[model samples]
Target chain A: MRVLFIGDVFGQPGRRVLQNHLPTIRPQFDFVIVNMENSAGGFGMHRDAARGALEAGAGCLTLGNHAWHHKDIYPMLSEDTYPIVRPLNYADPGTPGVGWRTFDVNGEKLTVVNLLGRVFMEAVDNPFRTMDALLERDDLGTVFVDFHAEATSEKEAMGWHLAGRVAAVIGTHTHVPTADTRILKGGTAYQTDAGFTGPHDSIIGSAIEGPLQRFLTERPHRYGVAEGRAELNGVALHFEGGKATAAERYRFIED
Target chain B: MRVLFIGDVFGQPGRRVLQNHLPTIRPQFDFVIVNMENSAGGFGMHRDAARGALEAGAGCLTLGNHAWHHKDIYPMLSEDTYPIVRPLNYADPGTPGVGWRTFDVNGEKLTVVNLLGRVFMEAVDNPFRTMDALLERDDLGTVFVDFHAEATSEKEAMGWHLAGRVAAVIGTHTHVPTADTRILKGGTAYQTDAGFTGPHDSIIGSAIEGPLQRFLTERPHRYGVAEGRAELNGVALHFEGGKATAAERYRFIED
Candidate 1:
């Protein structure tokens, strides 16, 4: 099956573009995965934006650390059975969500795992250990891992390491999609960073000036989602018998 | 300057056992960075553990995913100047902390990067990109990378991928350190996993019965830290100017 995955979604720009293009792109792929970390306020997730992603033809809304920004979504995570993954390693004795979850894509059992990188990530539990515990299940088929990290080395290492074991390992967080997207030696579709789906002209989907100013001054700057023309960054994945054969990325630009 | 870094601290057993031997261990090393991922609740770093670790003469504390379990330590993160690195990749665009920090050990600056794996982890970002960005910085005398990962192949591949660019790339997260600690062809220290610093009477530092029972019964089990007495598991690294010349793992069991 052919899968199409988009980058990170910064703010309104991403939503706008995604909304416009998803209608055309949704039918091309079997399933779609959208990243909504910075969509709400550039750090945490907002339910309206998450709902917007779903409306734009996302089969599942994959989240990162920013997913928990809104406390209301915390409860939504436990009750939502639509394969929205937070982080497996985040699951301690009693954490709020399931890291890796399974769903069927047109009859194929698909396992999607949400993993956070420790290289430059929040200090959660060990993601490596957590993944080991989750992937040990034999019934899990066609595993697709969304690796939210800040380093390409960690993502490449994971792809190289899990070459044949998983269906694909998609990188997120940086908001810039890397050039190294391909099927690995082990049949896993891999990308260094899938980039963001929100804004095109912003600093990782936000207004670039505020971030630039904050970085230069080392002061707190209120973050705002980019407005006006928007785009949606997402992925449409195709699987057959639980394996991702092909994957593509779409960057919707508003004219 | 010679530096010795301990592995992940599991629980009381890991702390109590390792603490008893630091007196003898401290004199032999010029600098020390110990792993303290599970020092508190077998899933995170505790405030008491953080204080106790520094008091025990540890120069710095390197952490994995469990670095953020203690709510009190959140403040310490912004205030820490001792170079307690949480994986360089963890400090992405908007993360609340820094992953790789530089340390002035013995009058020389050393760059240490703590990065996590994504194979079985939370979908955060990309560690590879984070490391790549980290490597571009020219402020350190040497670069040491502690890769917390699950697959041995990933760890082994990292050693090869970063052979000549950095001083050392040590793999951790397995709790059971691999025996392949050796300098790669590129003048980098490479080890598959740094091994755990917890207790021997447990499964990955937890009571063996619960984990074992879960595996056998195919049911979810609550994991707890192995308590009793604590022991410290760590590696003694010898560096001349910045490059690590030698490394040896030392374990102290609780009597």
Candidate 2:
């Protein structure tokens, strides 16, 4: 079976690109997951954007550090009624939503687990320990993980830690796609970063003008959704027998 | 004239390292500046830390993003009687402490200015614009800037922007010593980072165990001043005719 993971969908450009590309690409994969942490105004997931992603062929949705920055999706996460999951390793008990969700993909069991890293990122229950606990209770047949984090070392460690145990461990955050995208010897697909799906002209999916001004002037500027052609970046995974057989970094840029 | 800038002093270990070396080094420099943003704990400045630095030959103390992490130094900063200055470009008028301070260095004038970066850092007044405004108000001959910033590009821009305008532009914050330690063609002494003066055995001045565990496990760990030999890191500059004539990166490790 084939599974596709869409990199972070940032701002309007990200949403637009997903709408434009996912439908055509979704036909090839049995499941498609997308990260929407930067979907709502380049901060967090909003209700409308999240819904559009859910409706538009997304098998599952996820969030990371910007999980609760936008309060619009609070109800959906609180109710646990959506296909989305925030980082499961939050230290706070009051944090809304679960970190993982299981789906039935045509009589096959597929579980998507999202995690957060503490190194150079937000505070949360240990991603490594949390993943271990996630595995302890149940013998998950096919486990796919979205390790939302910063720092290359931490993400690399996480990938190595769960290499043979999980089907795929795709890194997110930083909004930049990393170089390494391949299945490990243990049959686990891994990529340091899945990159981001948004306006390629922008700086990390924000208006280039704002970043430029902020850097040149050392001042705060209103960063908005970049008004330009966008791109879709992600990892396409081929899995069989509870393991990743092959993986490819799928990138599509609008001219 | 000689000016010595103490890089970010982190935690108790840093304080110890400073007290050990400053006494000997203080006599050499006509003016000594210290960035104590990390002096209190691993966070912001405290009253005791501030007072001790002042007494230990800091011609003036400066702070950055962690300027207010510790509330203990609020009264000192509010009174503005101390020689300590926070980032001058704060958008909030209610923020305690001034960003720049003018000192009567014997027979000459020396204005020490502290600034914060907007890129990859917290929100504050624009450093570039604010510096320009500061210069506009007064020629402020013999200006020495403690640019407490993150990104190399922003810090480099600040240096170049005020190359001829300021006597020296030494960067802090990043807790690592940079490779470039020389006088620019415009006569301003420049360094991307002066390097943090703290326990070298630690991770950026914190205990190594914490960083090791945090990265290895991707979990929250208690970070404290490293329990090992500490080091003092800084830059020494010789200025004449309102420009740097020579410079050196100073480093001292406790056995």
List model 1 lDDT by residue over B1-255, tens digit each.
677777787788777765767767788877777788888867777677877788887877788776777775577677764447776665456665677777787778877778887655665456655677678777867888888876443454456556678888877776655444567555677666666677754546676556555533547887676666455566677776556677766656566
Each candidate's DockQ score against the native complex? Answer: 0.02, 0.05
Kindly provide the TM-score of model 2 when superposed on the true structure, using C-alpha atoms.
0.54
Query: For model 1, how does the per-residue alpha-carbon lDDT over A48-87 read when each residue is reduced to its tens digit?
Result: 7777777877766678867777665676776764446676
Top DockQ: which candidate number? 2
RMSD of each: 15.1, 11.2
Clash totals in order: 79, 2
Residues A157-225, candidate 2: write the lDDT tens digits. 677678788999998876656545667668999887787888765555666567667766546988777
Model 1 regions more than 4 Å off: A1-255, B229-231
Worst 10 residues of 2 chain B by lDDT: B200-209
User: How well does each candidate superpose onto the true structure, as a TM-score?
Assistant: 0.50, 0.54
Candidate 1 is scored at a TM of 0.50
Query: What shift in Å separates residue A167 of candidate 1 from its native position after superposition?
Result: 38
Clash pairs, model 2 backbone: A177-A195, B89-B125
* CAPRI classification of candidate 2: incorrect
| Worst 10 contiguous positions by lDDT, candidate 2 chain A | A173-182
Per-residue error at B81 for model 1, in Å?
4.8
